[PDB]
Amino acid sequence: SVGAIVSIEKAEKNFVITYASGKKAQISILNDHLFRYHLDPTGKFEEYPTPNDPKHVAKITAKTMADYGTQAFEQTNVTDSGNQFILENNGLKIIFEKESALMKVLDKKKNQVILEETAPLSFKNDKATQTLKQSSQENYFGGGTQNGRFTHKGTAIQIVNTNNWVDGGVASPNPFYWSTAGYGVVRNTWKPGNYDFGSHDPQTTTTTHEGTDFDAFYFFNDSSAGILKDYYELTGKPALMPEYGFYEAHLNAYNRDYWVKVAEGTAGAVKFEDGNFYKEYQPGDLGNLNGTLESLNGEKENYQFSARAVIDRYKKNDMPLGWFLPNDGYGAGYGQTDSLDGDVQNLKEFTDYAQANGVEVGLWTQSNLHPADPKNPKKGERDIAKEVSVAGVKALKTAVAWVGYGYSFGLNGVEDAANVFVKETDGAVRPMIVSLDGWAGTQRHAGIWTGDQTGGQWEYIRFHIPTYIGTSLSGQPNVGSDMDGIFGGKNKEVNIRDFQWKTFTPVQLNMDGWGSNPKTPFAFDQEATDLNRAYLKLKSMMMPYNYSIAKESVDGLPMVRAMALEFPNEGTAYTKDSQYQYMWGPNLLVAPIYNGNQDEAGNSIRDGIYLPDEKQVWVDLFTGEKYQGGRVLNGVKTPLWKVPVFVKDGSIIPMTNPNNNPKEIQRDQRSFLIYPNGATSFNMYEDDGISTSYEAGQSATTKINSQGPKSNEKGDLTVTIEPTKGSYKDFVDERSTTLDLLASEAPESVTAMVGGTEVTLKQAANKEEFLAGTNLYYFDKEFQVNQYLSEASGEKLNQSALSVKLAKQSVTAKDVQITVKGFINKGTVDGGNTTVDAINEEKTTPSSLTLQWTSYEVERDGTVFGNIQTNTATFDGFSHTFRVRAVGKNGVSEWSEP
Ligand SMILES: CC(=O)N[C@H]1[C@@H](Oc2ccc([N+](=O)[O-])cc2)O[C@H](CO)[C@H](O)[C@@H]1O
């Protein structure tokens, strides 16, 4: 312990705290809610922590202390207030008890103590530990990719480069956590740590990092978006993926292995287009067998075994494919020549072919990306500069084999790679890097994938959902994983369920070559293939929405959102009651199927669907079925074709034509799927999709406003598309406009103003007239959000919509105002009417209680459960008070005895 504080002095650039031990700390005030506290036993007070190697020059911070300016520091006063020293600016009171040295921070806007040390910093055992008060309602997020976990109260998390990709490991640590009390802390260290959020003593949180230094950035903010924006201003805004990065990729090696003709039914046999069965061999496993060597371009009497042939199969199977890594395999390489330049020419010809097919090429790496002598490369070296400038590579994946050391290593590597992409293309290619073993800052260059796990089993989904959520809460919105795992497979239902929910996630990797079957969306039967295509096409149609929430995640909430981000006033949104669902942007609640529980009809039984907000209607995206929030639904029947996705009524979802890659998007069209519910709004972002020019303001935004009746009510609806602001290379100014307004009745009238001039709309007599014509509207009871899913599910999945089409117009010069009179979107709402119209001892397990007494509701520890279809209900996931009420046609009853 450094002892009592004897003095706090305002120096030229920071406040100097002198402890009775003679140890000093510097407080740097960066803005009115962010400060750095640096207790440096060495007295050097260097701006940056020591990395694990001096060549690791990429910094945690993206903004220097000097870049924040001196204003907040100038406007912070130190006062000697008897038993305390106080630092005070417009934002914070930082209060230090003189005798104990304990720091506490009053947020002056809240007039509440947000952070309070309860024991002094401890430097024992070559670690630096802070001990904080933990309050009963205080929750904690962050830590990076905390495999299986997102909400950390009552647990400890390891801030360690664990190189463990399965539940309970850490695929990508981050020394960043935040408290729902309204603070975030970045430990300014490259050293591993352990954050114990009151795992045995619930009133104490301890944060420990190895080392002899205590250096931390403390930021105070009253919103989760503000905490993340603080983290991003400090450590770097997330990179915005190029549009193609949101599309599934195919990853494997096509330069190294051999295919041997085998019998059908041979272990590992794969059928090819010649109608024969082949089994894949590494060259060293061939033994006396003879096979056909793979190549990227299939130029060697081997076309069906080539990387080109895989592009052709995704095309033949009409599957989206954004990008392709053809060298993803240990020692695989990307050419078979005697030179790097010969291999780069082979890869360039692959990239020409991939690009002719609308697919970008990335490379995997297990190594440094530069030759020992770039002017004289050796065969088998890497030269990301030539790979980029000569071969046209646009993306990079960093194997643990490269970045496995962790901490400063990965950040240095991905920073250097990002700079090469940009420099070699003069900014024509923005970075597209997928990494792991990250740290604070990684997000500004790279997204993460979660590493190697076994698919073909429900645990593959179950642990991934919270993993994504917690990754995103850690300031990494660009998260992905392998589609149905790198290992295993042979479980059709898991495969379909994985493609389903990852539609509503950023990055999808078909990590092929290691599994129980090929890793593609067409590896299973036609039922699975058509479902996977349907969900992949839905993602392609959602690209304007997805790109818009991606833009938001550059300086705001991430794309995968913990329930608490969108519903901060509900306790359920913070706990493991929210571990298996999330908001995909603001507008979609995704509650993936994550276990094999079923009925005899093969329907999955989904428990614990938490629908927030007693005042909010949630709309099944596929069927239009409506559900009242403020409840957790158990026993929800979910057919194989379906993933539980609910639209937040009010949602504007920008859409586009189904497409297999960004070059197939019609840039001369725009389309909005709207669920009007009072006054809502959406900001649609666009840019050139590929370059760094967005960072220099080459982008455009379009504000869409929907102003109509509340859910299920009738009224006037005004949809206003404000003029598009901004421009960029190959910006298309002249676009047609579609609105698909979910509606339950034909309107009284639909009128259209374009830049203040009326456009006469005709009522289409039928769908074919509507589809053929422009300046029309059409009330359609056969509206399909996803025709591929309708066809794949064997369900029509018809919904009712009022669709409106306007002719091409200048989107910059002229707005759109559509007025619908007699607008209504009414359906029956499950739990819509909350109007007031024993413990079964023999069934008590260790962790499940069964209560007995058109449906019922039960309150479990202050959380309301619904969809209880019979005369009993069991509650589990226990290591409790039960009230029950009846549900009928005309409302409910009041709470029975606790
Ligand atoms: C975490 C990581 O880098 N994963 C890579 C890596 O994966 C494996 C997979 C299996 C083993 N093993 O059986 O011991 C080791 C490493 O390299 C793969 C190369 O194809 C993939 O890139 C995978 O994502």
Side-chain angles (χ1 to χ4, degrees):
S1 168
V2 296
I5 301 165
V6 304
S7 71
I8 306 191
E9 301 302 345
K10 194 174 193 182
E12 180 174 324
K13 294 191 176 177
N14 53 48
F15 294 94
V16 175
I17 309 180
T18 304
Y19 294 95
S21 67
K23 297 296 177 189
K24 294 192 187 283
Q26 286 184 354
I27 291 181
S28 304
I29 306 292
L30 292 188
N31 66 35
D32 64 356
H33 65 281
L34 164 70
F35 65 91
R36 184 181 176 174
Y37 169 99
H38 191 182
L39 195 172
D40 187 357
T42 78
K44 291 180 47 151
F45 293 101
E46 280 173 337
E47 161 152 23
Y48 297 97
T50 312
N52 285 342
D53 189 284
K55 291 198 159 70
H56 298 172
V57 295
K59 306 301 188 308
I60 286 164
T61 61
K63 181 168 179 171
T64 70
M65 285 199 303
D67 282 340
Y68 278 92
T70 64
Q71 312 85 29
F73 173 64
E74 291 172 50
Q75 292 181 41
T76 307
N77 305 317
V78 55
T79 58
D80 179 347
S81 195
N83 289 323
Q84 296 88 45
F85 289 112
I86 303 178
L87 303 185
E88 186 174 0
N89 56 43
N90 71 110
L92 303 179
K93 284 197 196 165
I94 312 169
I95 302 157
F96 297 88
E97 192 76 16
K98 292 178 176 187
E99 178 59 39
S100 64
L102 298 179
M103 185 180 79
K104 72 189 180 184
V105 181
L106 183 87
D107 181 300
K108 289 174 67 171
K109 191 167 18 164
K110 296 174 171 182
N111 192 39
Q112 289 173 340
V113 174
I114 302 311
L115 177 148
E116 176 164 351
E117 291 189 304
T118 53
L121 293 176
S122 178
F123 291 90
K124 76 171 49 177
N125 307 135
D126 193 39
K127 296 159 193 263
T129 299
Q130 177 160 64
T131 302
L132 302 175
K133 186 178 171 175
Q134 178 176 151
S135 298
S136 65
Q137 304 297 295
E138 191 169 1
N139 280 272
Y140 301 97
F141 307 119
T145 303
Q146 293 284 335
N147 309 354
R149 291 156 292 149
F150 83 102
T151 185
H152 308 309
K153 184 191 189 65
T155 77
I157 57 169
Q158 285 76 248
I159 312 303
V160 175
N161 193 69
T162 64
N163 288 145
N164 172 358
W165 324 116
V166 301
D167 176 60
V170 183
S172 192
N174 190 353
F176 165 48
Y177 80 95
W178 56 276
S179 165
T180 64
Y183 76 77
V185 187
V186 169
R187 189 83 75 90
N188 194 34
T189 188
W190 296 109
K191 297 306 200 340
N194 183 240
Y195 300 167
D196 183 281
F197 299 111
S199 62
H200 39 56
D201 171 11
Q203 292 174 325
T204 307
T205 289
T206 65
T207 60
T208 299
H209 282 263
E210 295 187 0
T212 59
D213 189 67
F214 190 90
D215 193 8
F217 296 102
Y218 292 92
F219 35 103
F220 299 80
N221 213 306
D222 65 0
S223 70
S224 42
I227 291 283
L228 289 173
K229 286 173 65 169
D230 290 332
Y231 169 76
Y232 293 153
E233 179 176 351
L234 182 61
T235 70
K237 287 176 191 185
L240 177 61
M241 286 193 299
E243 290 181 20
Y244 76 77
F246 292 87
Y247 291 68
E248 65 175 349
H250 193 83
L251 299 78
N252 201 343
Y254 297 90
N255 194 57
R256 182 175 174 92
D257 286 353
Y258 287 81
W259 289 96
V260 172
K261 198 191 290 187
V262 296
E264 178 164 13
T266 301
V270 178
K271 199 189 185 172
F272 279 78
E273 287 76 17
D274 64 355
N276 297 133
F277 287 90
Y278 298 86
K279 174 178 173 63
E280 200 172 13
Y281 286 78
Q282 293 179 25
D285 298 333
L286 253 203
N288 52 24
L289 300 168
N290 281 310
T292 303
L293 173 65
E294 302 163 25
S295 65
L296 270 58
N297 294 309
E299 80 279 11
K300 296 189 169 188
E301 297 306 314
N302 64 340
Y303 187 83
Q304 68 188 357
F305 302 119
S306 70
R308 293 192 177 190
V310 181
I311 291 182
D312 296 348
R313 288 187 190 99
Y314 277 78
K315 177 168 181 196
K316 185 180 219 150
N317 285 280
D318 183 31
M319 292 288 181
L321 181 66
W323 51 299
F324 197 103
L325 274 63
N327 73 327
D328 195 317
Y330 287 100
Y334 50 70
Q336 295 160 347
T337 77
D338 297 322
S339 66
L340 182 135
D341 277 351
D343 287 2
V344 164
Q345 163 72 26
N346 186 60
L347 175 64
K348 176 191 177 310
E349 292 192 44
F350 176 66
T351 299
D352 286 343
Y353 188 77
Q355 283 183 185
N357 281 277
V359 175
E360 301 296 338
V361 172
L363 294 175
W364 180 88
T365 188
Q366 60 178 122
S367 73
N368 188 264
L369 290 173
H370 302 276
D373 172 7
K375 304 290 159 75
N376 300 289
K378 301 177 189 278
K379 164 71 188 191
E381 288 193 295
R382 291 301 303 274
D383 186 345
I384 189 65
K386 285 182 167 166
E387 294 156 6
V388 172
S389 62
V390 175
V393 164
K394 287 208 188 78
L396 181 71
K397 166 182 171 191
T398 67
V400 69
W402 187 33
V403 297
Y405 290 115
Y407 311 101
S408 50
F409 185 103
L411 191 70
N412 189 242
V414 304
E415 182 151 300
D416 170 76
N419 295 344
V420 174
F421 280 96
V422 170
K423 187 184 179 160
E424 290 301 326
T425 66
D426 296 313
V429 174
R430 71 174 75 157
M432 177 59 195
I433 304 170
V434 304
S435 196
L436 37 64
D437 287 13
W439 203 245
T442 298
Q443 69 284 336
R444 75 196 187 234
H445 301 304
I448 70 90
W449 100 104
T450 57
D452 302 341
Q453 321 83 9
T454 300
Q457 61 195 2
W458 287 107
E459 173 61 18
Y460 189 70
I461 299 178
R462 183 206 68 79
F463 95 96
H464 257 123
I465 302 163
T467 301
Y468 276 50
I469 297 162
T471 299
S472 302
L473 288 170
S474 298
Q476 172 56 276
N478 287 126
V479 57
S481 63
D482 297 336
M483 287 317 308
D484 198 19
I486 186 169
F487 310 129
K490 294 206 156 332
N491 189 320
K492 168 174 165 186
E493 289 73 24
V494 172
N495 190 259
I496 288 165
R497 268 66 169 79
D498 208 45
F499 273 95
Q500 282 166 337
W501 75 280
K502 291 180 180 171
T503 303
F504 310 93
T505 67
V507 168
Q508 295 173 266
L509 305 175
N510 291 282
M511 180 56 253
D512 185 30
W514 296 82
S516 296
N517 48 259
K519 297 298 173 160
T520 68
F522 43 90
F524 285 83
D525 66 353
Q526 200 68 54
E527 175 169 52
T529 297
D530 291 345
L531 287 176
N532 294 340
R533 182 187 307 98
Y535 280 94
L536 289 159
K537 291 289 186 180
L538 177 58
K539 193 183 203 188
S540 84
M541 289 192 279
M542 290 179 60
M543 282 310 304
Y545 176 81
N546 291 344
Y547 208 49
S548 299
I549 65 166
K551 158 71 172 173
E552 178 170 358
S553 72
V554 172
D555 197 18
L557 292 179
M559 296 180 261
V560 176
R561 297 179 191 185
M563 297 309 299
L565 298 184
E566 287 297 313
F567 300 95
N569 295 327
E570 300 188 22
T572 312
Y574 291 78
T575 69
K576 281 191 166 185
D577 287 329
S578 290
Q579 69 186 324
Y580 299 135
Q581 57 178 80
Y582 60 89
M583 301 298 300
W584 175 242
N587 287 354
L588 292 169
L589 190 161
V590 179
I593 300 306
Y594 65 82
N595 71 39
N597 296 348
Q598 286 179 3
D599 66 23
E600 65 289 358
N603 294 312
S604 300
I605 300 157
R606 182 53 148 79
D607 295 314
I609 301 179
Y610 160 44
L611 295 181
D613 187 352
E614 61 178 351
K615 294 184 177 177
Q616 178 71 60
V617 174
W618 293 99
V619 190
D620 183 318
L621 172 64
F622 304 116
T623 72
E625 291 159 312
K626 279 175 155 167
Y627 299 79
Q628 199 65 31
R631 301 178 296 152
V632 178
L633 304 189
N634 287 348
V636 174
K637 291 181 186 292
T638 308
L640 177 58
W641 62 262
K642 185 175 199 189
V643 55
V645 179
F646 303 85
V647 178
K648 186 178 183 189
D649 208 17
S651 290
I652 297 149
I653 304 172
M655 300 286 274
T656 188
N657 55 284
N659 59 268
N660 283 334
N661 55 72
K663 282 180 201 311
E664 287 188 353
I665 290 177
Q666 302 303 290
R667 304 289 176 173
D668 64 338
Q669 303 175 7
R670 60 200 183 160
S671 187
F672 305 96
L673 183 67
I674 309 191
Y675 291 71
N677 166 33
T680 57
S681 189
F682 196 92
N683 303 128
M684 179 175 72
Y685 177 82
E686 55 183 81
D687 66 18
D688 78 12
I690 193 54
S691 83
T692 62
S693 294
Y694 79 100
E695 292 187 291
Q698 299 191 18
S699 65
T701 57
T702 301
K703 186 162 189 192
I704 308 96
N705 303 279
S706 166
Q707 193 268 296
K710 294 290 288 178
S711 300
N712 300 305
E713 304 294 336
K714 179 172 286 181
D716 288 3
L717 171 66
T718 301
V719 176
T720 309
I721 306 163
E722 298 182 17
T724 296
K725 292 203 83 72
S727 194
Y728 58 82
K729 182 167 151 68
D730 292 330
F731 173 86
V732 177
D733 187 55
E734 293 280 329
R735 309 192 199 165
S736 62
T737 308
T738 303
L739 306 184
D740 294 315
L741 308 172
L742 283 302
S744 55
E745 294 171 23
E748 288 164 23
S749 58
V750 188
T751 64
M753 298 284 280
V754 172
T757 299
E758 178 148 26
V759 173
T760 293
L761 299 182
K762 293 191 161 221
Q763 183 177 331
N766 50 63
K767 202 187 265 254
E768 317 90 73
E769 178 184 354
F770 185 62
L771 292 189
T774 81
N775 299 335
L776 299 171
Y777 63 93
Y778 185 58
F779 179 59
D780 188 0
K781 298 200 72 177
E782 296 200 313
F783 182 78
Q784 293 175 316
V785 62
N786 187 353
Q787 187 174 341
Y788 300 91
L789 187 54
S790 294
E791 296 182 347
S793 67
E795 305 292 8
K796 292 176 179 182
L797 303 180
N798 284 329
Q799 292 186 66
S800 302
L802 172 59
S803 295
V804 181
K805 285 174 49 169
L806 299 179
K808 286 201 186 187
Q809 70 184 73
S810 172
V811 298
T812 62
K814 306 185 173 174
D815 75 354
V816 176
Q817 187 191 255
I818 301 312
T819 304
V820 183
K821 296 262 171 60
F823 180 78
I824 183 171
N825 186 30
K826 174 177 214 207
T828 304
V829 182
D830 172 66
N833 189 14
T834 28
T835 305
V836 178
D837 174 1
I839 293 155
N840 182 340
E841 309 305 327
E842 286 188 81
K843 214 258 145 247
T844 307
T845 79
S847 80
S848 85
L849 287 165
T850 296
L851 203 65
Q852 44 172 65
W853 51 85
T854 60
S855 49
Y856 295 91
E857 298 192 327
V858 174
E859 189 188 36
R860 181 231 57 198
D861 311 337
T863 293
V864 177
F865 284 80
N867 196 37
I868 304 161
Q869 290 303 333
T870 189
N871 209 82
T872 187
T874 127
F875 301 84
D876 64 12
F878 293 137
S879 181
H880 308 282
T881 306
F882 292 126
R883 289 189 286 163
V884 195
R885 319 163 315 183
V887 190
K889 318 217 197 96
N890 305 331
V892 300
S893 66
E894 215 177 21
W895 287 123
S896 71
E897 65 155 3

